[PDB]
């Protein structure tokens, strides 16, 4: 009963554009919305985010996250490993590649979500969330080598899955970092389960 009539380009950059979307409201009245989109989608979705479960025997299971400066935020964020999917790449392949590049870890796909929206009131951006296990006992993961691409600068922070929310709160409290909403949502549900 609601649907897009048209979009008016407001401003296009190299990586992001602003549109004015005209849409039919469910009363039959026509309305406008200021919407953001990337210019980079070609693609099941814009990006992948990797939930990476690091499994070492006789250790707590950890979730591997990354810390980076994020120029939109003017600060450092803690996030799942993630990046945009290349033209021609499957989400799974993007997932394993971004993981290795951002963490050095070599991972196995467990499951892959449908495209899920990042901030649907504002943008059209979507990602596939990709759950990956990391056999931390395997020789290839002994000395994980992060491969930063041009201008990427990423730190690895592995936290125990069993205390995840508490540990993220501590980092925020002590280190003035911003935790990602999806990382937080996952850390919350780990506590809320049962």
User: Which segments are annotated as binding site for Mg(2+)?
Assistant: 82, 98, 102, 152
d(C-alpha 35, C-alpha 49), whole Å = 22
Examine residue 28 and tell whether it contacts its own copies (CB under 8 A): no
CB 82 within 8 Å of CB 174? no
Examine residue 16 and tell whether it contacts ligand K07 (CB under 6 A): yes
Examine residue 65 and tell whether it contacts Mg ion (CB under 5 A): no
- Residue from 47, 83, 107, 144 touching Mg ion (CB under 5 A): that is 83
For the chain, how many residues are written? 194
For 42, the token pair is: 């070609």
Nearest to 137 by CA among 67, 51, 61: 61
Give the phi and the psi of residue 30 in degrees, each rounded to 5.
-90, 135
- Residue from 8, 30, 31, 137 touching its own copies (CB under 8 A): that is 31
For ligand K07, the closer of residues 21 and 44 by Cβ is 21
Treating both helix axes as pointing N-terminal to C-terminal, what angle do 181-192 and 164-175 enclose, rounded to 10 degrees? 140
- Residue from 73, 122, 170, 189 touching ligand K07 (CB under 6 A): that is 122
For Cl ion, the closer of residues 117 and 188 by Cβ is 188
- The contact pattern for Cl ion, residues 39-78, with x = CB under 5 A and - = no contact, is --------------x-------------------------
- Residue from 8, 10, 33, 162 touching ligand K07 (CB under 6 A): that is 33
Residues 77-136 binding its own copies (CB under 8 A) are: 77, 79, 82, 113-127, 129, 131
Minimum distance between the CB of residue 77 and its own copies, rounded to whole angstroms? Answer: 5
Nearest to 92 by CA among 44, 55, 155: 44
Q: Supply angle C-alpha 80, 81, 83, rounded to 5.
A: 120
Nearest to 182 by CA among 116, 86, 99, 108: 116
CB 50 within 8 Å of CB 98? yes
For ligand K07, the closer of residues 37 and 56 by Cβ is 37
How, if at all, do strands 47-55 and 16-24 pair?
Answer: unpaired
- Residue from 101, 118, 123, 146 touching Mg ion (CB under 5 A): that is 101
Select the binding partner of residue 101 from Mg ion, ligand K07, Cl ion, none (C-beta < 5 to 8 A, by kind). Answer: Mg ion
């Amino acid at each position: 009963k609601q649907y897009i009539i048209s979009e008016e380009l407001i401003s296009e950059g190299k990586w992001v554009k602003l549109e004015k979307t005209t849409y039919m409201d469910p009363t039959g009245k026509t309305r406008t919305w200021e919407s953001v989109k990337r210019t980079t989608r070609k693609q099941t979705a814009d990006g992948v985010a990797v939930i990476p479960v690091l499994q070492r025997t006789l250790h707590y299971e950890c979730i591997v996250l990354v810390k980076q400066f994020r120029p939109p935020m003017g600060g450092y964020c803690i996030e799942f490993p993630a990046g945009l999917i290349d033209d021609g790449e499957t989400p799974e392949a993007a997932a394993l590649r971004e993981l290795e590049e951002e963490t050095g870890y070599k991972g196995d796909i467990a499951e892959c979500s449908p495209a899920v929206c990042m901030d649907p009131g504002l943008s059209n951006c979507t990602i596939h969330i990709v759950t990956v296990t990391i056999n931390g006992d395997d020789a290839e993961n002994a000395r994980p080598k992060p491969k930063p691409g041009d201008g990427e600068f990423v730190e690895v922070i592995s936290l125990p899955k069993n205390d995840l929310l508490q540990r993220l709160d501590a980092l925020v409290a002590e280190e003035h970092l911003t935790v990602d909403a999806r990382v937080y949502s996952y850390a919350l549900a780990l506590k809320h389960a049962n």
